[PDB]
Amino acid sequence: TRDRVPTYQYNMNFEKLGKCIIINNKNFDKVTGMGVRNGTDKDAEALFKCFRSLGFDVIVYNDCSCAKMQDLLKKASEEDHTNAACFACILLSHGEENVIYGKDGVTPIKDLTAHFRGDRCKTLLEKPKLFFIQACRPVEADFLFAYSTVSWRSPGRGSWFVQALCSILEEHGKDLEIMQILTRVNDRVARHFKQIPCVVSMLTKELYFS
Amino acid sequence: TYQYNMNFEKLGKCIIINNKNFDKVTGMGVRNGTDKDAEALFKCFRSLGFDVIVYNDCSCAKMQDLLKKASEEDHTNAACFACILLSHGEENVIYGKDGVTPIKDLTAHFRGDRCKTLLEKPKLFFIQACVEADFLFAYSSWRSPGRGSWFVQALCSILEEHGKDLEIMQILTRVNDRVARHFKQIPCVVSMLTKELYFSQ
Numbered sequence: 001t002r003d004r005v006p007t008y009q010y011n012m013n014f015e016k017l018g019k020c021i022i023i024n025n026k027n028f029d030k031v032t033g034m035g036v037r038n039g040t041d042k043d044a045e046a047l048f049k050c051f052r053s054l055g056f057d058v059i060v061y062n063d064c065s066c067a068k069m070q071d072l073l074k075k076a077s078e079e080d081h082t083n084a085a086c087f088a089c090i091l092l093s094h095g096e097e098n099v100i101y102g103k104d105g106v107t108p109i110k111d112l113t114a115h116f117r118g119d120r121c122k123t124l125l126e127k128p129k130l131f132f133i134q135a136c137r138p139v140e141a142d143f144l145f146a147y148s149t150v151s152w153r154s155p156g157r158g159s160w161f162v163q164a165l166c167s168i169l170e171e172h173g174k175d176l177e178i179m180q181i182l183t184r185v186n187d188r189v190a191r192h193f194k195q196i197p198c199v200v201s202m203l204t205k206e207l208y209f210s
Numbered sequence: 211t212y213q214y215n216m217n218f219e220k221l222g223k224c225i226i227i228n229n230k231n232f233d234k235v236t237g238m239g240v241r242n243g244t245d246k247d248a249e250a251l252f253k254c255f256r257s258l259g260f261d262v263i264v265y266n267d268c269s270c271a272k273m274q275d276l277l278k279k280a281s282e283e284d285h286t287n288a289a290c291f292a293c294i295l296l297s298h299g300e301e302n303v304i305y306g307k308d309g310v311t312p313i314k315d316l317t318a319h320f321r322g323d324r325c326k327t328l329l330e331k332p333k334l335f336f337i338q339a340c341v342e343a344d345f346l347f348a349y350s351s352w353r354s355p356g357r358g359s360w361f362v363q364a365l366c367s368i369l370e371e372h373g374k375d376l377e378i379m380q381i382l383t384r385v386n387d388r389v390a391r392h393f394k395q396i397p398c399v400v401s402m403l404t405k406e407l408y409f410s411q
C-alpha cells in the first residue's frame with residue numbers, strides 16, 4: 001500500500017472522466033496483404049465495457065480507413081475537454097515500427113497522437129492523454145502510451161494484453177495508480193502466457209481514476 | 211508479492227559513463243556541467259546503496275566492453291543493476307568520444323539470456339543526451355554550463371529525499387513534473403518492469 005498525496009495526483013474533480021475512443025480494426029483491404037484480425041471483436045467488447053465501468057464516455061469505431069482515423073482523432077481534439085479529467089484512445093489494428101494500419105493502408109502513430117499536443121488541444125492541457133495500442137506485428141507532458149509489445153492474440157480468446165488489462169482494471173481500476181495497473185499487466189502477459197508490453201510515460205502526476 | 215525482492219547483500223552495481231570531451235574527429239563540443247551532473251549522480255546512487263564507479267570519456271569500444279564485463283560479472287547477491295549515460299546523442303544512438311553507438315547495443319548484454327544472474331531483477335538505464343522484461347529507461351535534454359542539467363538536478367533532489375520511500379515510477383514522475391515546471395522539454399520513462407521497485411527492505 002501507498003499514500004495518496006493530493007498535490008502529487010491529477011485532479012479528478014471534473015464533471016466527467018473523459019472521452020474514450022476505441023478504434024477496432026478487423027478487416028483490411030486485399031491490397032495491404034494484411035489479414036483478418038480474429039479475436040479483435042472480443043477485445044473491443046471487453047475494453048468498452050471496462051472503460052465504461054471506469055466512467056469514460058466510450059465510442060467504438062470499426063474497420064476505419066487512414067483518413068477516418070486521422071479525421072475522428074483531429075475532431076476529437078477540437079472538442080471542448082474543459083469538463084473532462086482526461087482522455088483515452090485505444091487502437092486495435094495491424095502495425096509496424098512507428099506506424100498503425102487502417103483498412104486502406106498505413107499512418108504514423110505520431111501523426112495520430114499529435115492532435116492532442118498542448119499547443120493543438122488547449123482544453124486537455126495539463127491533463128493525461130492515455131493511448132493504449134495493440135498493434136499485431138511542454139507540448140509532450142501528460143502523455144502515456146501502453147504498447148502491446150516492445151504481439152499475440154488468441155483467435156478464440158482475444159489478445160493477451162487486452163485480457164490482462166481488462167481483468168486488472170475491473171479489480172483495481174479505481175484503487176491503483178495507472179503505472180501500478182500497467183506494471184501488473186506487464187507481469188501478467190510475461191508470466192500468464194513470449195511477449196512483453198511497453199509503457200512510455202510523460203505523465204507529471206499520479207493518475208487515479210476515482 | 212507485487213514488489214521486486216530487495217533481500218540481497220548488495221543493492222547492485224551502478225556504472226556512470228561520463229562523456230565530457232569528444233575527439234575532434236567526432237565534432238561534438240565540450241559538455242560543460244556534466245562533471246557537476248556526474249558528481250551529483252555519484253552521491254545520489256551511492257546514498258541509495260549502489261556500488262558506483264564513474265568512467266570518463268569512454269569510447270564506443272570501451273563502453274561496449276565496460277557493459278559486457280559488467281554483464282559477465284556475478285549479480286547473484288545483487289538486487290538490481292543501474293547504468294547512467296551522460297553524453298551527446300541522436301535518435302536511437304549515444305555518442306562516445308570516438309563516434310556513435312546504438313543504445314540497444316549497450317543494453318543488449320543484460321538481456322535475460324546473456325546475464326542470467328540478473329534475470330527477473332530490474333536493470334535501470336538513465337540516459338541524459340544532448341528477454342526484454344525488467345528493463346527501465348529514463349531518457350533526458352538541455353543543460354546549463356555552470357549548474358548542470360535540469361533532469362539531473364531534479365532526479366538527485368527527489369532521490370535524496372524520497373529514494374527510500376517511493377516507488378521508481380513515483381520518483382520519476384515527480385522528476386518529469388519538476389523538469390517540466392522549472393525549465394520546453396519533458397523527460398521520458400520507458401518501462402518493462404513487472405513489479406514495483408523500492409530502493410529498500
Ligand SMILES: O=C(CSc1ccccc1C(=O)O)c1ccc(Cl)cc1
Nearest residue numbers: 098109110113114117140143145202
Ligand atoms: O510515442 C510516440 C508519439 S511522439 C510523442 C512522444 C512523446 C510525447 C508525445 C508525443 C506525441 O507527439 O504524441 C512516438 C515517438 C517517436 C516515434 Cl519515431 C514514433 C512515435
